[PDB]
Amino acid sequence: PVARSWVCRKTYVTPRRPFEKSRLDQELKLIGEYGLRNKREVWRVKFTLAKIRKAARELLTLDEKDPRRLFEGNALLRRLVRIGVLDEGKMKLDYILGLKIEDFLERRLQTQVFKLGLAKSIHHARVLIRQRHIRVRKQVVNIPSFIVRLDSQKHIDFSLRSPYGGGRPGRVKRKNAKKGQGGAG
């Protein structure tokens, strides 16, 4: 009778056909292009889209001026506008159906760190985040999956406690300084 939660869901779905050449082609394109690490990472962005998409289609069965459909619709649109996937010109919920997996990987904090020009490559960008270099409003984000909001995009920069910012010089430089002083005398 313990005071625990147990509530947990999966974030991905494994595809039906495991060896579709055209699927293995397109998913490895997405991984290499946006610098992911496994097929589960594409499958979970695909499942977040499919949930949004399933919700959107459920609202399209309901008649216009249905208070559930207006409230739930405007909420789902506002949620997609906030995360910077859907434009403010396109906040009608028949444009959510015309929406692709690439647009959510564009808002990945790995891909934003790359596209804001404070990382050299998409693979460098993951290293920086995973080695807790970057911050989002004086909050060190360690995790590259951080879906950056449209509200929260320009406040991405290096952490104050990182040597790529105004930070203490790292372990290698400090050993190479001690080596340089050890060699001379």
Binding site: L28, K29, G32, G35, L36, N38, H123
Partner: peptide
């Protein structure tokens, strides 16, 4: 291993 293998793989297949 991890993404490094998968990067090497992408760089072999396409680019």
């Amino acid at each position: 291993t991890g993404r490094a293998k998968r990067r090497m793989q992408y760089n072999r297949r396409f680019v």
